[PDB]
Each structure stands twice: as C-alpha cells, then as structure tokens.
UniProtKB/Swiss-Prot annotation:
Free-text domain note: RRM domain 2 has moderate RNA-binding affinity. RRM domains 3 and 4 may facilitate RNA looping when binding to two appropriately separated binding sites within the same target pre-mRNA.
Domain RRM, first and last residues per copy: 9-83, 91-179
Domain of life: Eukaryota
Gene (UniProt): Hnrnpl
Interval of the full protein contained in this chain: 408 to 623 of 623
Name of the molecule in the record: Heterogeneous nuclear ribonucleoprotein L
ATP-binding found in the keyword field: no
Keyword DNA-binding: no
Modified residues (Phosphoserine): S8, S171
Organism of this sequence: Rattus norvegicus
Keywords: Acetylation, Cytoplasm, Isopeptide bond, Methylation, Nucleus, Phosphoprotein, Repeat, Ribonucleoprotein, RNA-binding, Ubl conjugation
GO-annotated cellular components: chromatin; cytoplasm; nucleoplasm; nucleus; perinuclear region of cytoplasm; pronucleus; ribonucleoprotein complex; ribonucleoprotein granule
Function of the protein: Splicing factor binding to exonic or intronic sites and acting as either an activator or repressor of exon inclusion. Exhibits a binding preference for CA-rich elements. Component of the heterogeneous nuclear ribonucleoprotein (hnRNP) complexes and associated with most nascent transcripts. Associates, together with APEX1, to the negative calcium responsive element (nCaRE) B2 of the APEX2 promoter.
C-alpha cells in the first residue's frame, strides 16, 4: 500500500464553473488515482458538484495532494462526505454540451478498473513528469503542440514518443512542471479528440503521473 486512506468513497466540490470544469474535467483530474464511478452536479449550481470513486484509496489521493489546487483560475473549495453513493435526481445538459450527470464504472481503459488488475499496479502522488497511452501510431510532438494551440494550454518542455509493433498505437512521456499549467493541460488534453473535422478516426489518449527522471 501507499499513503493514508479515506473514510468515504465520495467527495464534494464547489467554486468550479461548468464552462471549463465539468464532469469531463473532474474525470480527467481524478481518474488517474483510481477508476471513477459516477458524478452529479447538485443544488442546480453551475459551481457545485459531488463525485464518487471505485475505492477510497483514490479519494484519499485527491484529498491528500489535489486538494486546494485549481485549473483555469477558479477559487478552491473541496471536502469529503459520508454519503454511501451519489444520489438520484433530475439532470440536464450543460453549456459545454455534456450532461450534469455521468458514469465511468463501465470504463476498461485503466489498469485498476478491476480488482484483479488493481492488485498488480499502484497509485502514487505526482512525479513532476507525465505519461500518455493509446494514441494513434502517427502522433508526434508537433501534434501535441497544435492541439495545445486550440486548447490555449501550455506546451511541454520535452517530449518522448514510441510506437508499438503490430499494436497500431503510440505511447510515451511528457516533461514540464507548474501547478496551473500541468492541471489545465491534464483536464483538457486527456481523453481529447484530434483536430479532425468529422472525427473519421480515433485519437483519444489517456494521461497520468509516472515516476521518471527524464523524457526518454
């Protein structure tokens, strides 16, 4: 095991904004510590929500190191709750085109989405270096620069890319470190769609923290 542990599988957050922080950005910032279960916005506020995860060891990780950090200049308010799960209610579309409620328990894109794989993998605090996977075999550092240009986020200081044989995909590392620049890029570059106009081919790639000493 690593670090302390939470007392609940659920948490709550305020001060966010539905135009740059919603169910997809909270999934991109909390899922790299354990698979998320479901999320909902609460009391009809554009700046209040609640989240649940598959285990409390992932809730503890965002509580111990993601706490009081924000992305896109928002003021930080976050706490843990004693509720057993996210509760049902009415839902509607946000201005970002996503729903006020979402689920992620059906995801298989993580090495901890099942208790048999979560027993051969670990969760750890940030390592000032990131890693990416499941990208197409045609991606390069120049493609990461032209996507960060449409997201307005900061570009990495170094890049590492490698394509697998007969796997038709690419994986690698990215190296840069700042609080607001690494958290904004994580929330908008994770699970993101390429510059293609009709999406005739997939490009969605995952992001997470990895223990590295260089981008090679």
């Amino acid at each position: 095991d690593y670090g302390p542990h939470a007392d609940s599988p659920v948490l709550m957050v305020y001060g966010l904004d539905q135009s740059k922080m919603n169910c997809d950005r909270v999934f991109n910032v909390f899922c790299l510590y354990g698979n998320v279960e479901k999320v909902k916005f609460m009391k009809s506020k554009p700046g209040a929500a609640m989240v649940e995860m598959a285990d409390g060891y992932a809730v503890d990780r965002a509580i111990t190191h993601l706490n009081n950090n924000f992305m896109f200049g928002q003021k930080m308010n976050v706490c843990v709750s004693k509720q057993p799960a996210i509760m049902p209610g009415q839902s509607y579309g946000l201005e970002d085109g996503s729903c006020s409620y979402k689920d992620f328990s059906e995801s298989r894109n993580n090495r901890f989405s099942t208790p048999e794989q979560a027993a051969k993998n670990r969760i750890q605090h940030p390592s000032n270096v990131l890693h990416f996977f499941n990208a197409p075999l045609e991606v390069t550092e120049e493609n990461f620069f032209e996507i960060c240009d449409e997201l307005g986020v900061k570009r990495p200081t170094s890049v590492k890319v490698f394509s697998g044989k007969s796997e038709r995909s690419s994986s690698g590392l990215l190296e840069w470190d700042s609080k607001s620049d690494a958290l904004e890029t994580l929330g908008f570059l994770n699970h993101y769609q390429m510059k293609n106009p009709n999406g005739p081919y997939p490009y969605t790639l995952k992001l997470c923290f990895s223990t590295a000493q260089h981008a090679s």
